[PDB]
Symmetry: C2
Subunit: 195 residues, 2 copies
Amino acid sequence: EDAGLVAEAEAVAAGWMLDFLCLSLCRAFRDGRSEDFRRTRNSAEAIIHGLSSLTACQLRTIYICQFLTRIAAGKTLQFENDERITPLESALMIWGSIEKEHDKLHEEIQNLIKIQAIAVCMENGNFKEAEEVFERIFGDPSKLLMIISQKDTFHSFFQHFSYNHMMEKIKSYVNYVLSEKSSTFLMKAAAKVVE
Amino acid sequence: EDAGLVAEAEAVAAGWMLDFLCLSLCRAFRDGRSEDFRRTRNSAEAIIHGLSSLTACQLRTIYICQFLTRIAAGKTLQFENDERITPLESALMIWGSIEKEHDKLHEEIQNLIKIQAIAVCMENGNFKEAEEVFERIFGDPSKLLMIISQKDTFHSFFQHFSYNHMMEKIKSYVNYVLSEKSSTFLMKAAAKVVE
């Protein structure tokens, strides 16, 4: 009448799924497979609710997932209802909190997000928001006195902190993560069978 | 630059998860772990959307899941909105369609569900519905001329086709399934590590 070790077995099988899906979510992300990334995130989110305690590595995983689903919605402005903040703004918050080295790349990804968070609003044609976003990210004299000039003039076109340079830098970061967890149980075992 | 075999790897890892969760969903079900069964079903449903094609064994799995989440909501009458039918009514439909032998047990489980589907409404105190349900399940002269007498008299108490006899028979069936898929990859491997 096995019991309790079963519960513990599930946790191991849970953590496996969590890393397998984080890996999946990453590939779809780099490979730009929209209707897929969404599908994997549903499973991630569902599997994640299935956990009430987490290791340091796992929290790292979860946040990377949260982080990527956010920027994955960047240009999607009704934004996320639970918090009246914009997706990239929320991605900015997670980024500067994930337990990770602040390399040169980290800083690059942070300024792209910071800036693009304004540009996206400017694109959607919502400059009243573009200003609101700008307010929340700046406002305490990081190029600022300049940016207020853009929102003001709806001068929506002139810096190399482009949306695509942002995705690139983020995709390049996903590759480290992507590799670091490619030998993770579930997937490694999965390929073995595909032979 | 691995590619495509990766997609195929995921499908194998998908089918693994699907059976692992079906197994999980079963234990929680037999062991009556409400806030858990719900959690596992979320993951099942999420993982299931992650599949666009399915083997015969897999469809068997899915339906058993669908089947159990339904009776798991039996006494829950607003019922499921997408279809203006009651949960047990819907569980009755799946049951008589799962690719499985119609043993003595099968027939038992079918008459319990059939009857309880009326009794639940009678319990919730909704006899107008109790009649509607009765209409949809009967009405073409299977104890019937009798049952219309109960709904009429709100004589809500007097047969051994009890709700609990229903859960028992269903729980006993879950044990075959439960066993048949206990050596399924994921879980077996999971326990090995728990040692």
